[PDB]
Amino acid sequence: AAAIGIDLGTTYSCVGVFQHGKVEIIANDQGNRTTPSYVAFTDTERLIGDAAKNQVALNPQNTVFDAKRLIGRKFGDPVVQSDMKHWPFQVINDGDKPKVQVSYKGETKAFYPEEISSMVLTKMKEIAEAYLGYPVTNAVITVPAYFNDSQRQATKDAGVIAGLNVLRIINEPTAAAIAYGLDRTGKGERNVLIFDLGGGTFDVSILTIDDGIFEVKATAGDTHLGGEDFDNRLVNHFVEEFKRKHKKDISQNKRAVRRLRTACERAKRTLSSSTQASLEIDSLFEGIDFYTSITRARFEELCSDLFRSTLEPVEKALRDAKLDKAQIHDLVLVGGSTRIPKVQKLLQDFFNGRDLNKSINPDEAVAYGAAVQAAILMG
Numbered sequence: 001a002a003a004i005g006i007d008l009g010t011t012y013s014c015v016g017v018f019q020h021g022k023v024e025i026i027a028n029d030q031g032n033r034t035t036p037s038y039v040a041f042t043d044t045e046r047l048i049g050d051a052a053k054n055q056v057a058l059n060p061q062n063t064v065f066d067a068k069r070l071i072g073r074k075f076g077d078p079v080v081q082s083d084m085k086h087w088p089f090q091v092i093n094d095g096d097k098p099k100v101q102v103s104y105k106g107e108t109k110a111f112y113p114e115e116i117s118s119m120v121l122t123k124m125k126e127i128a129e130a131y132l133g134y135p136v137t138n139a140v141i142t143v144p145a146y147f148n149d150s151q152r153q154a155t156k157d158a159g160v161i162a163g164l165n166v167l168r169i170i171n172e173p174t175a176a177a178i179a180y181g182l183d184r185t186g187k188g189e190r191n192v193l194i195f196d197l198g199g200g201t202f203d204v205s206i207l208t209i210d211d212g213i214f215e216v217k218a219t220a221g222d223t224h225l226g227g228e229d230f231d232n233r234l235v236n237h238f239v240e241e242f243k244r245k246h247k248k249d250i251s252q253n254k255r256a257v258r259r260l261r262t263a264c265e266r267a268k269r270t271l272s273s274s275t276q277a278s279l280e281i282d283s284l285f286e287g288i289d290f291y292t293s294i295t296r297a298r299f300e301e302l303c304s305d306l307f308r309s310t311l312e313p314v315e316k317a318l319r320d321a322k323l324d325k326a327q328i329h330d331l332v333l334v335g336g337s338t339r340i341p342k343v344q345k346l347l348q349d350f351f352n353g354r355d356l357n358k359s360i361n362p363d364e365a366v367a368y369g370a371a372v373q374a375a376i377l378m379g
């Protein structure tokens with residue numbers, strides 16, 4: 001049986017397999033090449049992935065996401081205390097370890113973050129097994145470069161709960177470098193910069209690769225900047241537009257805000273390949289349909305500060321690595337938000353016209369490299 005590579009992402013996960021001389025990224029039951037890192041509990045079912053994200057507006061209190069923000073942390077960690085003020089689901093304290101508390105099949109239940117992530121990993125495993133036609137038991141799983149031993153342990157524990165032998169836990173930027181074959185270089189230092197703008201986090205990493213050996217030279221970014229912020233800019237824009245068109249404020253109707261958010265995320269994706277997108281939300285608010293449009297240019301304006309803010313962590317990482325821009329051999333795009341043309345323009349311009357490595361879907365590069373590594377480890 002082939003071993004698999006799994007990107008267990010903050011917002012989206014992705015699974016790949018290396019066989020027959022190549023990596024294939026595996027689409028799920030809906031045809032999607034990435035799967036939301038979401039788990040929902042209802043009066044009757046446990047839903048994972050697309051099914052879980054697709055009912056978030058209906059069931060906010062029992063739809064769990066962002067488990068990766070809790071994994072391997074203590075309850076009293078300032079990160080946990082701060083993050084929990086912003087989630088619709090309850091987080092409780094059990095022996096200074098956080099647990100997510102939900103209603104499931106009529107009963108109050110609580111789960112450790114690694115249990116929630118194990119459910120995501122189970123879905124990713126099953127996605128792979130549907131493609132391969134047999135059970136999968138070996139995996140490489142990735143984590144952020146900044147993850148500590150506790151966060152790495154708990155991630156491993158998630159994989160083991162999901163029925164996987166975890167061949168190795170490897171760093172996301174390293175996996176992305178592997179995807180581009182940058183681990184084969186030979187003697188002589190190669191400096192690689194990974195620019196990873198995802199769904200909820202932004203990570204810049206500078207790696208030095210010397211004869212297949214990776215050193216993390218510098219890291220920077222913002223653990224609370226990502227696609228969700230661009231979605232929100234669009235939300236506030238369309239909230240205002242609805243007010244002017246229909247003289248109604250939808251902002252206190254949680255379901256309406258969430259449904260508009262979904263539509264905004266979709267329109268955003270479309271604007272990476274088209275210069276205009278249509279939004280059509282049946283019965284957005286009090287039976288009023290919301291049928292509108294937005295241009296790529298207007299989207300870029302709404303997010304201009306946030307897009308530009310990605311450059312200073314690049315500046316900082318270069319300073320910390322003691323490297324000039326011209327000393328970076330390769331620039332690698334990771335994370336779905338790097339599909340945004342304005343983001344690519346900013347980074348390319350900052351690097352004075354340098355090529356960006358983007359031939360592998362950026363939201364798939366980590367899984368792609370994990371899959372290669374998994375195959376290497378199997379022999």
Ligand SMILES: Nc1ncnc2c1ncn2[C@@H]1O[C@H](COP(=O)(O)OP(=O)(O)O)[C@@H](O)[C@H]1O
Binds near residue numbers: 362
């Ligand atoms: N074509 C696209 N254009 C703009 N953003 C996109 C596109 N495709 C996916 N995204 C965004 O990428 C983000 C997810 O990034 P991804 O790398 O899949 O997950 P993660 O950051 O959790 O690892 C989401 O905010 C999503 O809306």
Ligand SMILES: [Mg+2]
Binds near residue numbers: 009010198
């Ligand atoms: Mg990611």
Ligand code: NA
Binds near residue numbers: 010011014
């Ligand atoms: Na991901």
